[PDB]
Design a protein around this nucleic acid. Structure first.
Lengths: 110, 63
RNA sequence: GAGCCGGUAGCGGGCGUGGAUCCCUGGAUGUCCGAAUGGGGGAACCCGGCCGGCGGGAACGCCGGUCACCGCGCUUUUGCGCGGGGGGAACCUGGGGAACUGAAACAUCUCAGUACCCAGAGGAGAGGAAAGAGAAAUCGACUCCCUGAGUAGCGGCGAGCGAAAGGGGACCAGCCUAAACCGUCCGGCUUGUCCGGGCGGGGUCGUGGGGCCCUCGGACACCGAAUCCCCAGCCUAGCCGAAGCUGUUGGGAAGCAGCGCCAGAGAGGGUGAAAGCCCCGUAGGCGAAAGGUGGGGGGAUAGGUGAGGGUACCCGAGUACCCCGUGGUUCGUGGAGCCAUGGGGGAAUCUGGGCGGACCACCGCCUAAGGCUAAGUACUCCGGGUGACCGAUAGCGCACCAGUACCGUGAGGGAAAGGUGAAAAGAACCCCGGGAGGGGAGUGAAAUAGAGCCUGAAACCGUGGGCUUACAAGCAGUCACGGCCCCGCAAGGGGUUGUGGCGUGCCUAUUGAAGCAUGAGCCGGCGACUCACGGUCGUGGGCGAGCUUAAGCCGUUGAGGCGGAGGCGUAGGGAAACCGAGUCCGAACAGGGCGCAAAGUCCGCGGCCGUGGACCCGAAACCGG
RNA sequence: GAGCUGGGGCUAGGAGUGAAAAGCUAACCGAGCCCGGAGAUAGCUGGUUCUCCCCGAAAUGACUUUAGGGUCAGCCUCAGG
RNA sequence: AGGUGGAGCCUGGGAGUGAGGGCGCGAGCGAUAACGUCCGCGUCCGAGCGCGGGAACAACCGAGACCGCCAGCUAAGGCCC
RNA sequence: GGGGGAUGACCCCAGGCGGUAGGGGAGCGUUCCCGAUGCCGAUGAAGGCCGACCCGCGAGGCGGCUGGAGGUAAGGGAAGUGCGAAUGCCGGCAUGAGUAACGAUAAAGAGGGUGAGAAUCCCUCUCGCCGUAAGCCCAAGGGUUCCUACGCAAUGGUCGUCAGCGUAGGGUUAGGCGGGACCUAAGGUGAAGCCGAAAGGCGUAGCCGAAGGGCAGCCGGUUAAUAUUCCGGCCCUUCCCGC
RNA sequence: GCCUCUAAGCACAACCUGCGGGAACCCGUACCGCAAACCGACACAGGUGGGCGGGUGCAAGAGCACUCAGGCGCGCGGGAG
RNA sequence: GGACCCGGUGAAAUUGAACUGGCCGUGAAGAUGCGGCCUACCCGUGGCAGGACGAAAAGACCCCGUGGAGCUUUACUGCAG
């Protein structure tokens, strides 16, 4: 990991959880400030960019896989019709309501 | 890297600081030449100009 | 650390924090081929002994396991138990080993001991404590880098080939056995005293070893391993990890503006258009294991050698030495040695025996005719780092269902081909139509971004328009004058031409060229005076005695700085002895070289000259497998 | 019938075979073909790129297994005296 | 002596052609034959000594092409079209 | 060259200036490395497309249209650098040219049928060509090409609803047929044996080696395809255990 | 395969026979196949080994003319002459 | 039976480029393109060969490179035997 391309080499080829490494971030005031150690993943938040910028929503699906996730809110409808969840650019991602009602959620991040 | 007809460098050859070079008369003698005497008095040294450039050069360096 | 059943996105179904996917390491399966090895064979198939369940044997009997090739030691007995062989890009030594081409032919020579083939060792082999080097009574392993030196020198003295000791540097490092002398024996002959092989003595580093007699003397000396954990390094994932938000032009902002923080980590990359502070598992910096491989380093293992004189003496080899015929060496037959050997003679055991280049005297060196020896140099399949290194005809030829498609019987050849977008949101539905494909709607910032769908130029085929075209010559055309047509650089120009006016295309090689001499159908991209070491003049400049190897150290950036063997100038003149601002010819003051300082030297950048495939492609041929 | 033939094989490419012309040897063997020496040498042949300034050539003589090469001269050019 | 004016000389780096023809003249050969060749004296061309002339024609007579389209004298050569 | 040049420049006149090999000087764009107290751009990097300002020039600038993301260096450094042009290499693209060819002069024509559309398919009726073949068969070679249901984009040197073309499904069974579970000649291997510098050469016996030797059957039926194997009727062989 | 037999074991259990029960594998087949499915790079009038090859006529006969069974009209059709 | 007219398909070497006439002259000496002149409307298809020094191929006949390759003998040398 000392060159441009060795980034694709220990992130997605190595431990997929390394991609978890990607789900990385912070969120609201509470929690955050409070720290930032111990995540949740499929939590809630509210992006901060892209037309949808400054929006309200929640963490639907830990997609690490595709390299990002989905946010019920954030989405769109096809052209045939039916609606649908859009792709979640890892990038602009916000979480404040730190999914933690599940004791195991509060025993790791908040 | 370089050397030189080391030869000629051997036989006939060798320069003066002057930037010039000379080798022994070279009329006839030392082969056929019952010929004469005074003719004998015909072997000191001969300094040819112009060409003495291939020469010198080609030798260049040590001599 | 919380998602997954690989690239498959799709249907149908499912595992999971009372630690799934996957990252590691050590496992158990590993069907058939392939050194193949049980036997055969046109590989990937077909055949046999022993055990084996016993197995459907419904009231009737099989696969599985197995096993065994052959050359190697030798507990020999009837031989039981260990090693090998096959690979492998490049690199290593041995075994064998060539023409081209240069010499402007070519027989000597060169390319070379190169290219190739063969065998085999290794992770490195090569080599390696000297019958060495040379001569200052000086040096000491081998190797490798610089230097010595393009010197001494080899030669149809032609083209060329072209050492070494010594000095500087990296490394260090030393040991064994036959080596019958002693004793031990075991086996023979046949009892003695012979040869024999296992045990020690010694088991030689730079001359010693034994055997005898008296002095001995009575603990720190580990190698190539052997050993223990040690930091065992790495082995993939180890994990934390400083600090901004609002406003805004925007389809998108991380941009434009306002305030705000970081900081040994403003390395880069991903983020809808360019962030230190959004993601980054990055540089900040600390982190990390029960298994696979070291030095460093600690210890005993420590294996192991380690002092005195004397005596008549016996103890590292079967061929040294010599004659002929080759080798290697700088040595091409030479005044020609050392070492290595093809044939034939066939010595010595320390006043022995080679050596210092024919030989000889004397001096000086060394002690052969067995063996082992890490480290210092080479090489990249592998993994990383870095780029005045490339961008799809460049780079490996091959950026991803390529050494595959494809021609070749074979050995072998050996290609082309990447790019939508922010993500599919990849075009439901309606239309002409057998469809493909075209018309609308919808995504959309734009689809003349639309599915081989970024940029998408030229050549070349179309569709309309301006001008122009039927008594006319030349590719061309360009100068004059005229009419139609447009004047986003208006009283000046655009475009097109009717006439007339003067006109032989374009490249190489040519005395000479339009050409009827050749070169080219058209467009686009590749495509040809380069680099290195020398030398050579010119110039930009640092000191005049000027200047640096190789290496040692220092190194986000990584910062150069020390290193003084050398080499050119400091006189030269001469074959040399040698002399020397003088000298060689000579016996003569007659000339040749030089003196007279004018002094360079290193470097940079250039026009060139030699070695180079070396301005670029071009053939018939020779030589290897 | 030194007859034509299928199938199985043996020889081999400086060497084979050849009722023999130098024939045939995977469709051109007067010495095969592939990879290697190797990008062989190649007075010959072509090829030999952007602009512009300045001057201005020879096609003779001398020696060459040299004559359609090239050495030295002669005629060019730039730097200083 | 030099009116000249701009060639000359030495040292030094970098070169190219190393085989040409055409015309006049003086010679050689040759059938005084050839756009023949062979030596000389000047010129000439050199793939641009490109333009004028002689119809056209490197080339022989005149000429030295830095550039200026709607100037002026002439050369050689011409002026009935 | 020369008369004074302030750095330009300005004035005189002398004085030419046509030029290939080839010699000297000066400049231009090309991709890179500086960022010598350098950074432009979503109101476009760049390339592209088009032009009546700047230069002798090779280029510049600059304005209009295009296109999705870069890179510029005011100055010095570096180099795989500038192309008609090599019967050049690679790619495309025109020629001749809507002429030359349909691969044997063994000819067809008619009615119906299917289909979006049939000279070129299916049924049917005349007619022509085989007939030693343009026959069935065994082999060798090639390997699903064979059948059946769908379909025609390209291959079919025209069509094409046809295919020996596409996708999907399915097809070929043997104690007695062939190959082995048997045999040897050539030849090839090859423990022993024999000779090579090494790789290797030869080579006994034994083994490999075939439509040569040997070996136990035949006729009918039966699907979209198989058949001496599937049906059935008829004919057998070798091994094993028992008596 | 048939007969002769050593080693050798049978010699109330070795081989021949008779009857009855029991056993019988490995891999090959489609269709093309004087050929668009095989070699000639292509649906190329080129080659490729064995089996009677049906008849009528001709002295005979795989030669010949017509045709049996089975095969096919050549994979480009019209139209002037 | 092609060729010709129809429908269907639809190549190919060579070629700088071209709107390419005859003449008699010319030039490097056998010209559609240069001079003078004479005929001269624009395009096409079925043809006929003459010229475009037509196409094929960087002459095999030639000479030149102190090129190459094969056979020959009292060529030179050297090896096999």
């Amino acid at each position: 990991s000392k060159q441009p391309d060795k980034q694709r080499k220990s992130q997605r080829r190595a431990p997929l959880h390394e991609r978890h490494k990607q789900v990385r971030a912070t969120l609201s005031a509470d929690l955050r400030e409070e720290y930032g150690v111990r995540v949740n993943a499929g939590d809630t938040v509210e992006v901060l960019r892209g037309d949808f910028a400054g929006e309200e929503g929640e963490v639907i699906n830990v997609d690490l896989d595709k390299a990002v996730i989905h946010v019920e809110d954030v989405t769109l409808e096809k052209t045939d019709g039916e609606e649908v969840p859009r792709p979640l650019d890892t990038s602009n991602v916000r979480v404040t309501d730190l999914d933690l009602e599940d004791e195991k959620r509060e025993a790791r991040l908040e | 890297p370089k050397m030189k007809t080391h030869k000629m460098a051997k036989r006939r050859i060798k320069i003066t600081g002057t930037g010039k070079v000379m080798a022994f008369k070279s009329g006839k003698r030392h082969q056929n030449t019952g010929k004469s005497g005074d003719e004998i008095r015909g072997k000191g040294k001969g300094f040819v100009l112009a060409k003495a450039e291939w020469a010198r050069m080609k030798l260049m360096l040590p001599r």
